[PDB]
Design a binder for these strands. Structure first.
Lengths: 63, 63
DNA sequence: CTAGCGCGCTAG
DNA sequence: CTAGCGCGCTAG
């Protein structure tokens, strides 16, 4: 419930309790939360993709 | 002669005397040098695209 | 090893 | 307004 998105063709969402590795070519923050059990499961989460629980991560980071 | 690259299907190169606006989604540094006269002319210049005259720009920047 | 999600401004 | 250059790690 911290962020949401869609990969391949399935919607997915996870709270901060499963997010940690998140980089960003130049789209948003390719984050990894899970993939059915807990294998990170990358995904692209844009500040507009999460419920206001992401754009704030860049507010204190790249600001 | 500061950087080089290729857009659409044509090679192009320009010295620092014509480069200034350069951002980067997540590929390198989309820079603008010219387009036949001097209209900026964007282009993607990766640290490996320029003759060692670019990777140094990120050495002091994002390092 | 392989596609995969997107962008970023971009010029006219 | 429109395509355009690429990536980044990404999981197995």
């Amino acid at each position: 419930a911290t962020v949401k998105f869609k990969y391949k063709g399935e919607e997915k969402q996870v709270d901060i309790s499963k997010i940690k590795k998140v980089w960003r070519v130049g789209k948003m923050i390719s984050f990894t939360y899970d993939e059915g059990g807990g294998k990170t499961g990358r995904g692209a989460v844009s500040e507009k993709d999460a419920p206001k629980e992401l754009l704030q991560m860049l507010e204190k980071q790249k600001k």
